[PDB]
Amino acid sequence: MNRGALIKLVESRYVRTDLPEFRPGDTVRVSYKVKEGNRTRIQDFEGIVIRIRRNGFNTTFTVRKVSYGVGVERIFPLHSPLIQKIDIVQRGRARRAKLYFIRNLSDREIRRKLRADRKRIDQDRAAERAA
């Protein structure tokens, strides 16, 4: 037998292929479904993806924003059914896999360390020009 496949088979029914590709250093907006009172709304959340932990189906990416004077990090199952969508908003060129150090950097200092990623930008604009 093969244990991996079977595992991959059980997951196979809950895998997403509509979410966009992205990297740490990018700025992301994640339209996320939320439940409250008593309905369900879609709460956007925009921050630097500082951590994409990978495992095929068990890939989970960490988005960081600074909300009113407080720094917030939050974890997203990359194949969660709660994510309505994900919009890219900037290609940051982090020169590293995990961005644990921008937790202590100033909004300015963070900008020097993640000046835009021109490449993965025109490359984006390269597409987007469908017919």
């Binding site: 244990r3 079977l6 059980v10 029914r13 809950y14 479904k33 068990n58 059914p81 709660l82």
Partner: protein, 204 residues
């Protein structure tokens, strides 16, 4: 008291109604009934199931023979499911519906000759203030001259793990007949690829 022999492949999680459900997957089926225990003949009710076909070159005569009287192809493993009598010659996960509940058995991982802070959750001694070579020691095992002895069943360092453990009331999350796969919410003992039994639950 339906039950089935099976192996442990691994565990991931799935989504069910905007909720994450940790699951452990099991290759339960298909188990062929190689013998039925009886009260008149053996004095008690059960069913000897087989699981995992085995290369006949490694199977010996008395075993090969026993597999004959049951018109059953060879197999790797043999376990019983007490007080269980399937109407047919073969058992499969189909006997489990989603939303049911089961008790799971597996030969837990083996921690070898493990310490007392690991087998019996002791606290050992401090790591400072004068601790002299006892940072992970138990403490005192008795009194003094009365009783002047050590208890039986006492808690000491020793082999821990690799012993039968039965987890109970797990949830049948889904069953994949196509492949003989039972999804059960929770933790199942033993390593992946290890043997497990999946018996109907005895709780309510």
């Amino acid at each position: 008291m339906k039950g089935i022999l099976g192996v442990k492949v691994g565990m991931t999680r799935i989504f069910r109604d905007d909720r994450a459900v940790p699951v452990t997957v099991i290759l339960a089926g298909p188990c062929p009934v190689v013998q039925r225990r009886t009260p008149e003949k053996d004095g008690y009710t059960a069913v000897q199931l087989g699981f995992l076909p085995q290369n006949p070159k490694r199977v010996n005569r008395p075993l090969k023979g026993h597999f004959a009287k049951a018109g059953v192809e060879p197999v790797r493993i043999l376990r019983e499911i007490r007080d269980f009598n399937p109407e047919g010659d073969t058992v499969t996960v189909e006997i489990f519906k989603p939303g049911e509940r089961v008790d799971v058995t597996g030969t837990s991982k083996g921690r070898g000759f493990a310490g007392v802070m690991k087998r019996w959750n002791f606290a050992g001694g401090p790591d400072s203030h004068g601790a002299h070579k006892i940072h992970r020691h138990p403490g005192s095992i008795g009194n003094r001259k009365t009783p002047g002895r050590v208890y039986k069943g006492k808690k000491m360092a020793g082999h821990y793990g690799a012993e039968r453990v039965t987890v109970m009331n797990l949830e049948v999350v889904d069953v994949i007949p196509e492949e003989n796969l039972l999804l059960v919410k929770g933790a199942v003992p033993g390593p992946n690829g290890g043997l497990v039994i999946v018996r109907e639950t005895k709780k309510a």
